[PDB]
Amino acid sequence: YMLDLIQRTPKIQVYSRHPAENGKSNFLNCYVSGFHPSDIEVDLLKNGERIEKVEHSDLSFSKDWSFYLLYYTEFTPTEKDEYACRVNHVTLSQPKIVKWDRDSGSHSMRYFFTSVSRPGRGEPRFIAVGYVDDTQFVRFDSDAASQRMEPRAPWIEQEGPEYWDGETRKVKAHSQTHRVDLGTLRGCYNQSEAGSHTVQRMYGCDVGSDWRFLRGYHQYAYDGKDYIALKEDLRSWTAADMCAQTTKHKWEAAHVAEQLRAYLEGTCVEWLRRYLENGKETLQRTDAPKTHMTHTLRCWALSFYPAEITLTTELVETRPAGDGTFQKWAAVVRYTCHVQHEGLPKPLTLRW
Amino acid sequence: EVKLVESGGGLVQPGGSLRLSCAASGSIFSINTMGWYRQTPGKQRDLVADISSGGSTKYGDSVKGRFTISRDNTKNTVYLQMNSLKPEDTAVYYCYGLSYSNDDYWGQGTQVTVS
């Protein structure tokens, strides 16, 4: 239930959903993350050749505004086959190839919106995703066929048409807003109608384990840099430069933040509860890491939900397995590995 | 380990055409996909067209329909027929190839200019 009103290069991981067994169906994953802007070309290679039917997740981004994507495909690895992932991006002189080296908590609802302008190529690209905790449950893509808000989790498919109509009406409103803003921000920063620019929106609400309201968010960004955001008290704005102060004043004079507070404190919480209940078999589970040590000292963790975890040198970003679970490892060059997870009885410790 | 010999570049009038050719050395079983990326005014190089030894092709959106890639049944050699060239196709075109172990090799490139 949504509202009703710089360049970073990617990090690449190539891995399987499950541990590889020669002859056993599996899933090959390429997780690209931490990059900006969102234009990226990702290929999955099999023996120096492009794999034909590769799918990918809906575009989303992290706190720092950097985007992340999961490209994946079903495959049965054998003895001779070798695999890799290729990534192109504006920050790369040539596409990078990475080979597949075979050898009790709070809750949240978050909506992510991304608009990218396409000078002289039609409307801007618009992508919207919705999350409960670390489980995405709705999406919208302007380039897609439906032109509707679409489910991405079982527990949201129960909702009837009045819900899906209202969501489709609300997302298209979020789209129009971004389209207008793209032309506006172009004007206030004196940029040409020939360049491509990105506008990102994020908002949502947190609740304790008692499902009572904890925190609320509403942030806006231009070309990967902060533009305006709601303070933690949800009653005032943070403008980032002389251009965003003009918006801050127009919004404080129209008391926009008051309508936001109501949603973030009331409506957002209310539907987060309805979702948590409707998908309790999913959202309210906790899966514990299937964990062991790899020797360079490397600590491993597989098939755990939610993604929040701590291992304590090289620490690789947590990555989706593609089945709802996540993975992570850490490395260091009389040593111990500490594993604080929100689904383990008590912290674990590991040593050779 | 592999060397890529490029030819066919140069200057051409708008609306003209050019045929690029790239030939791989080494063992005939040491290269699978071959194709071309092209330099942007910026830092990156964009995909133009490539083809697997079995004939599977992929093109960059901005040359779809105008450019065609092909391969010699015998030798490891690919051909890029560029038609209806525009000034925005001016760039250095780099041939590349992939080993059957997903190792990438890259040629020196060939400047293509469209008045």
Author numbering:
A (entry chain A): 1 to 5, 25 to 122, 143 to 334, 343 to 359, 371 to 391, 399 to 417
B (entry chain B): 3 to 117
Give the authors' words.
HLA-I proteins are composed of a polymorphic, integral-membrane heavy- or α-chain (α1, α2 and α3 ectodomains) and an invariant light chain, β2-microglobulin (β2m). In order to coordinate α/β chain co-expression and incorporate specific peptides during secretion from eukaryotic cells, a linked “single-chain trimer” (SCT) construct, coupling all three components into a single polypeptide, has been widely used. Success was ultimately achieved by isolating and recombinantly expressing the VHH domain from a novel, high-affinity, anti-β2m camelid antibody, allowing the crystallization of all SCTs tested.
The YML 14-mer peptide was found in two different, out-of-register conformations using two different C-terminal anchors depending on SCT design. The YML 14-mer peptide was found in both binding mode 2 and 3 in the SCTY84C/A139C background. We suggest the following general guidelines for choosing an appropriate SCT design, based on characteristics of the linked peptide: SCTY84C/A139C should be avoided due to over-stabilization resulting in expression of any SCT, regardless of whether peptide is bound. While reasonable statistics for indexing and scaling in tetragonal lattices closely related to the triclinic supergroup could be obtained, molecular replacement solutions that adequately packed the AU could only be obtained when reindexed with a monoclinic lattice. These conflicts could only be overcome in P1.
